[PDB]
């Protein structure tokens, strides 16, 4: 018996959400589609131009915790919030959904992060991230007894750039291994991805990362190249298992040759993509950890992403579970 | 030329949303479909057991003002936040509608309200209301010259279990009736009207209020009938214009003698009625203050309340203005 299933750890963030027009984006020299990091003035400025909004609990990580529970998984996360009412809210939400989240908040300064999220049209989201209190997350949030007790260990990315996280998942990537455990990332966003390319391939070389999550524009940054193929056949080659996904053309998963390829589920339409990798990866490591044969875990990743991009909010407000149960996979 | 047309006064509340079963309010003593106020012992009882949710910007005569601002017209709130982030989140909501508000916080404590509001199968709300910073709301937060230039002041029944909040609407009727313009009331809530049946019919009859706003059950509950036709017609002889709404079977419109019948829009199906009632308010006001008929003002107050029950938040994230141009309202 092992108490959990998956912990992830990532920057614990509350979106604010609003629906916004193409030109909006170019006007506030918004990159689309991706996470945009930005300061205190900067989150005031935006904020000032933001229509109405609507607030859920986010962070990549936090999600996809979020989403293990939901299918009926044991989930823990690690994350650091501030002691304030943005705080209190992603503490309730993701305990709320029976996530042991049990990090504690160091104080008022700086607030809990934030990430202003517009929406446009064609469903695409782009993030704006002011990291608060993220950047305090260390070494001492460490909790070594869930890490040793979590079957796999995930982590974000979106981690290395805030200054001390790292640390904190090279002491858990140290545990979890020493305890036989797997450590999975994602990696989380291109741009993330440009910046700390070989930071990223190190983790996979050396062993530290066993499971790797990527899209398609991460997977091409990665290795800096147009030809997806090539990404496919050196990503397969640096790290045990690869999930890829494809957006609306499904995902493949890599195991050294071997190469599973999954459809996207058919939707109803495109209310808002965010979370849809998250909830990819929580569809997966649940299957992961229920024993499943990786094209199942696929499947169960792109049934979790197919409900989140159906709805307003990066957590799914439906039973996955159920869900899951429907269609015929669990 | 007035500045504004339409200025609301209420209490200033965040809404924490979510789903819940039938079972939860019986288990938790939650009156089903009512305005339930709650100390600060029980708000934290009841959101440890509430599920994950979702915030948005609430407070009845907030969302009529917002609903006003959306259709076109030019709006202004009075309410009280706090100094702290859902009072920040509360104040950017409103602003960024493009309505007017400059009420002061005082301070951090008592922080701002919040309503936990659950959402039945049945796509009916049960809020659950710690007032907070709304009992500062008093005389001295009235914008003498806003009232002035209004040409609506528009109030909620529920400004009557904080302890100062009458005091204020009694300024505000003083003055817009020194400056010729028009008072209105809501009767919020039929346990509401249980707390206040007397206050209530005394600002009618003593010509307070101009244009009174009810549904069905309050209506009953301002003369402890179950007759709803004694109730139309008592309502008509104690004000100079009631406004009726009757849920799914639409509005009835009483002045003197003349009686204006309304049918309520289609809907696909009912995600969430919260709002519904303020949004019939922005409606009806918007087409008041525009000099519509009784009946067309009626029929945007439809339009707008069909609208909002079709989506999670009580404040519509569409253009009314395109709906009521689409529907030939204009
Ligand atoms: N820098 C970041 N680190 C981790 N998660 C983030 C970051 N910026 C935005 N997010 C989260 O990404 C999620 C979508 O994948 C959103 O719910 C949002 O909170
Ligand atoms: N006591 C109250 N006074 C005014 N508005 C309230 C109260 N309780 C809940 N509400 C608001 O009623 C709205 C629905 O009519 C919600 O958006 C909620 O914020
Ligand atoms: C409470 C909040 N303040 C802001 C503005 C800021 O971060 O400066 C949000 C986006 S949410
Ligand atoms: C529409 C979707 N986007 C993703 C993530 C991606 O490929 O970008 C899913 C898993 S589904
Ligand atoms: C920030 C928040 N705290 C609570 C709990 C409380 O009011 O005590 C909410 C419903 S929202
Ligand atoms: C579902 C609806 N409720 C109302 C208000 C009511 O009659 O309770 C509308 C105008 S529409
Ligand atoms: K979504
Ligand atoms: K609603």
Partial sequence: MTRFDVLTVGNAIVD????????????????????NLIDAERAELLYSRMGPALEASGGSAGNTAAGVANLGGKAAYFG?????????????????????????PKGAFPPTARSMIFVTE???????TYLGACVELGPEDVEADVVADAKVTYFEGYLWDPPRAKEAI?????????????????LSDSFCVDRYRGEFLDLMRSGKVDIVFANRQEALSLYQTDDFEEALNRIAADCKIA????????????????????????????????????????????????????EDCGKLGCLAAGIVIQQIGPRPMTSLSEAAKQAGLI
């Fill in 170 to 186: 090279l002491d858990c990537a140290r545990i979890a291994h020493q305890h036989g455990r797997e450590m999975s990332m994602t």
């Fill in 122 to 128: 064609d469903g695409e989201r782009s993030m704006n």
């Fill in 16 to 35: 604010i959400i609003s629906r916004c027009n193409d030109q909006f984006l170019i006007d506030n020299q918004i990159t689309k589609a991706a996470m």
């Fill in 80 to 104: 650091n919030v501030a002691a304030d009412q943005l705080g209190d809210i992603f503490t309730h939400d993701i305990r709320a959904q029976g996530v042991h989240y049990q990090t504690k």
């Fill in 243 to 294: 999930a890829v996904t494809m957006s609306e053309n499904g995902a493949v998963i890599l195991k050294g040759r071997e190469r599973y390829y999954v459809n996207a589920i058919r939707i109803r339409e495109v209310v808002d993509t965010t979370g849809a990798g998250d909830l990819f990866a929580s569809g997966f490591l649940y299957g992961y950890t229920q024993g499943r044969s990786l």
